[PDB]
Design a protein around this ligand. Sequence first.
Ligand code: A1IJK
Ligand code: A1IJK
Lengths: 26, 454, 428
Amino acid sequence: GQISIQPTFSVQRNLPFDRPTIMAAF
Amino acid sequence: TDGERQNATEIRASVGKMIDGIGRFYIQMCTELKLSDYEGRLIQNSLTIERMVLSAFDERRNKYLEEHPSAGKDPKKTGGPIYRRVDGKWRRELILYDKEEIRRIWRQANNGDDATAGLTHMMIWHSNLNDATYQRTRALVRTGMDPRMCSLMQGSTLPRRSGAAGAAVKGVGTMVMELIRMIKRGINDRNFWRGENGRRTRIAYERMCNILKGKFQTAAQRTMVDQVRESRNPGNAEFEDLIFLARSALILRGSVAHKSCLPACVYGSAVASGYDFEREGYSLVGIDPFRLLQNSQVYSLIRPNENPAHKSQLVWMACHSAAFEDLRVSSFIRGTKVVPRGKLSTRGVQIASNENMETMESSTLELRSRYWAIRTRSGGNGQISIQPTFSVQRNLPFDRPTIMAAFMRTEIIRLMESARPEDVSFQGRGVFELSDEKATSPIVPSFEGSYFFG
Amino acid sequence: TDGERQNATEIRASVGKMIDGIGRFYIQMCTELKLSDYEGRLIQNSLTIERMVLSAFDERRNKYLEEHPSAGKDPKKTGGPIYRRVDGKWRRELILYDKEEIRRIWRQANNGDDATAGLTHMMIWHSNLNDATYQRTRALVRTGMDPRMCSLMQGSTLPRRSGAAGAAVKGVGTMVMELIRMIKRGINDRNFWRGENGRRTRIAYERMCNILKGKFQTAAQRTMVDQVRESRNPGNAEFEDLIFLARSALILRGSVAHKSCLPACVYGSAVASGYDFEREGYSLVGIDPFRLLQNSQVYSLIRPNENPAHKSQLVWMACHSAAFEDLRVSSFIRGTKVVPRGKLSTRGVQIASNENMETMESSTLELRSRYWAIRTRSGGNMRTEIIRLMESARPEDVSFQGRGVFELSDEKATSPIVPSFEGSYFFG
RNA sequence: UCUCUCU
RNA sequence: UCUCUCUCUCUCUCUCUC
RNA sequence: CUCUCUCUCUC
Ligand SMILES: *[C][C]([O])[C]O[C][C][C][N]C(=O)C1=[C]C(C2=C3[C]=[C]C(=O)[C]C3=OC3=C2[C]=[C]C(=O)[C]3)=C(C([O])=O)[C]=[C]1
Ligand SMILES: *[C][C]([O])[C]O[C][C][C][N]C(=O)C1=[C]C(C2=C3[C]=[C]C(=O)[C]C3=OC3=C2[C]=[C]C(=O)[C]3)=C(C([O])=O)[C]=[C]1
């Protein structure tokens, strides 16, 4: 599935990501 | 600034001229295919017309078709499904058109010039629709890439004909897939990277490595791509190195351009309404697309047992290229909750040949957003010297360690560990109102899922 | 010398005639816009009047506006926010004026001559104000340059209309950014550098490279910029050496001219006082700007919850182009500590339309300095040789040996006052 | 002139 | 007749290993 | 470079 984000709009949000899964494969 | 206003005005006119051609061409084709107002505003009909244009200008494929014609299909005619409503029911009839006839019609609509910018714009619109609708994990696995990096798959369906304009909008993951396929062909074929053609492949490999490098933001990522480019005979080492680069892009996101490329039916309706894009100008990242969609009514074919709102949200997502954007931000701008792909009770917009075109009904698409925002080409996330002004005996200070400092893989891993899924990006930038055409007062949102393909 | 006394006196009169034209024109426009003594001395009003003249003489943009008119704005009329105080409160009303009427008023104030020097002088004043107020890392990042070289962006907002005079005051970073845009355009467009227009672009590329070469001091930097000029089809390689040249300027700084361009309100007040700049003469690098500012009183519109001292410091720095200068030397000259940009509780001087012009009050700007110094066009003191030079360079070498700061009463700059010296970076 | 969310 | 301190809040690009 | 330039723009 999706584990990250790619912003398209300029808004003050926080760009989420699945940190434990991204660093697991390192 | 004050000098880039002119340049900004120049760009607006040039894009407005492209939008005018698309609308003028669509109007001409609608009157030539004999389509009524309802059928002219059908998204399926616009898709067929757009695809006919793209195939008519496909010089390479057309040449191959001429040399090796397909079975029962002459390589000089194109077409697609045109849907007409007679007696209240919908029917599909396959239209065949001469590619020379379509090319002449397109050129006449753009004042006799080729205007490949309009074609690339339509190709981007198709790519955005494909990204929001279909998920290509099979290509990710087949190239050896982890199927989880679907957030970087922006513009993976863009044909190679879209250079520069197409390359700017495509993402890190798609770029890496292009590099990997080049690597795989070299490993499988020893003649690759050698001979007259190997020289051509090498220059192509260099160019797309540079544009991939410019997509990154951290210095560590750019240096890693620069090393891979230098490899004269790339192999598994670059294969793994690029795979690491793609995984790093999930945290240290690259710069992917986002543009709102609308269907040609919207432009055709606007141009027929007397609207002059060339005069007042246009912008694919500003308020212009949002304002156009507010006043534009578009119909679509809805298959039996399908929620019209979910299809409209899918078209809304494709229009603004927000397939991989946060659901919370998309929900805020639209004003109605955006659902993940798994909870969308709809199939693709394009209708298949084998589909019973008798239980199909049409509905109006709700392509209206409560707010409007500026599309970004940026990802996520002082003075070091002096310039004397007065004649004084002071010493001119500078930050020696930092200036001389700028003269691999462990560094990249360290960078992403520091990053956390809470950092505020685009600080102070919000979402405006449709009545606020000058982007004066931003509206910063306060924020359950956030992954469309989750 | 002894022969350049006549030359210096001649130059002083020519600059004084330019300032007299600026002052005379402001007086007429104030009398013709019907502005009271207080409103005429408002810095916001002076900027609006200045911006009206600059746009009235923009032949290229005016032509484009005629050919391709904007929406709701006729291309023959200009104007801006004029702030009028009646009954204690401030209100803003947009004034619309014919660009030809503005041109006639300006020309008549200069005895019927175009006087392009006055327009460029106002353009330099606006650039100095923009440099001290706003930091353009977006353009640096967009063009591919590291945003850390914000000290070399002097005069980055100056329009191309300010030639010679404008190029002298602009910095290495702005010159490099201009070249980098040319390279980026050439790389993207294959027809660039080719055809009749390519020849015109080539001469522009050569000329702007020549002024950049003259801006440098070390022989190594000049040779490398000479190499970049010789490239018939510059590309990524010429991209890199220009970036390297920009980075070397942080240590081996170039020669950037610094001139004190005051707001037109100060000149209008002085001319109304009877001062004859043509007779007494003027100079943008001497004591004249300092002595004018000491006796000049100017007001500004203060947004709520804003320190007037910080806004006055911002205007003082923009007046003398001390945006990128050492804070210690700037503090020593002014007499009151100059705070870095991050610690300034103020926004830009110009007020936006979306701002409620009802909670705004006015304050007097303290544009007076305890000391005065002479503005400098100089810095301080292949590629491996360039890196070797900046390695020997230390952030302790004394520059301008024996050259100090004088008193306002010492009009001949006879006895220098050498300072003895905690931050020093405005944008840091 | 094809089709597909999610190995 | 615009606006802004501090990473792109707008600066396209005139299509492909044809 | 402690003052010795500037009459404008790929108009
Ligand atoms: C390698 C080699 O072979 C390459 O070559 C190239 C050149 C040739 N071509 C010619 O001549 C021509 C073409 C054409 C076309 C076109 C053009 C342009 C554009 O852009 C597009 C196009 O498309 C097309 C074509 C053809 C065919 C098809 O199909 C498509 C022409 C026309 O069009 O007419 C002519 C010529
Ligand atoms: C380049 C080409 O394309 C074109 O050319 C043209 C030339 C002839 N004409 C002219 O130039 C003229 C101009 C004018 C003006 C002026 C002048 C001078 C100065 O310095 C400035 C100016 O400004 C202006 C103008 C105009 C308009 C506007 O708007 C501004 C003139 C008058 O003014 O009159 C004339 C001519």
